[PDB]
């Protein structure tokens, strides 16, 4: 995991390229905020995995689409 449920993004490959320009790998990691929300139609709390700049993604698209992928995954809450 460490999946941003809302953009479908993940960690991804990338090399450091240090001050001596060395190509040691570090790999880049999404900030991956594990974040709670409220849904008026169920009158319950849902937890959706969000990243950095992930909040503007949930607003502009809608909670509803993200929430339907949690239903699709099979998980309980």
């Amino acid at each position: 995991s460490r999946v941003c449920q809302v953009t479908g993004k993940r960690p991804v490959t990338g090399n450091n390229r240090s001050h001596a320009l060395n190509a040691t790998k570090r790999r880049f990691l999404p900030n991956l905020h594990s974040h709670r929300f409220w849904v008026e139609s169920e009158k319950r709390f849902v937890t959706l995995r969000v990243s950095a700049k992930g909040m503007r993604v949930i607003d502009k698209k809608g909670i509803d689409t993200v929430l339907a992928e949690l239903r699709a995954r099979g998980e309980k809450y």
Partner: protein
């Protein structure tokens, strides 16, 4: 994230006109009580129409917290029955679940949730001072009076 904020009170509140705001104000503080509508850019022109109709109705739903600010900042004895020991020991106490739901502030809930409480409330029968959430941001005294069940 932006929203279209429908509250009029507190630190931000422009009654149904769009004003872009930080993301801790947007969604999570307001939507557990349905106080904002998303800036999703599918309905935002309708939302800015809808407010002209809505606000005078919406303003009376936003006269709910004013009661609480009247009725606790000028304090009287909130009378609560709780389970006493043989020596007046409040085993059970009032705490967070009796201070939320039976208080005369608006006679309604403020969502019981998490609270900071840096030490207890209520530990023997009789009156005592209890500083609790008349509003989400605003900590103020009520006076309690406890009697036996």
């Amino acid at each position: 994230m932006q929203v279209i904020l429908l509250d009029k009170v507190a630190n931000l509140g422009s009654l149904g006109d769009q004003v872009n705001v930080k993301a801790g104000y947007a969604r999570n503080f307001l939507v557990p009580q349905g106080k904002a509508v998303p800036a999703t850019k599918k309905n935002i022109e309708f939302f800015e129409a809808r407010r002209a109709e809505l606000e005078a109705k919406l303003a009376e739903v936003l006269a709910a917290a004013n009661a609480r600010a009247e009725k606790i900042n000028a304090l009287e004895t909130v009378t609560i029955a709780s389970k006493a020991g043989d020596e007046g020991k409040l085993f059970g106490s009032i705490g967070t679940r009796d201070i939320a739901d039976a208080v005369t502030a608006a006679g309604v809930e403020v969502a019981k949730s998490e609270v900071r409480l840096p030490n207890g409330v209520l530990r023997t029968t009789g009156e005592h001072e209890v500083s609790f959430q008349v509003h989400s941001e605003v900590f103020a005294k009520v006076i309690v009076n406890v009697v036996a069940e």
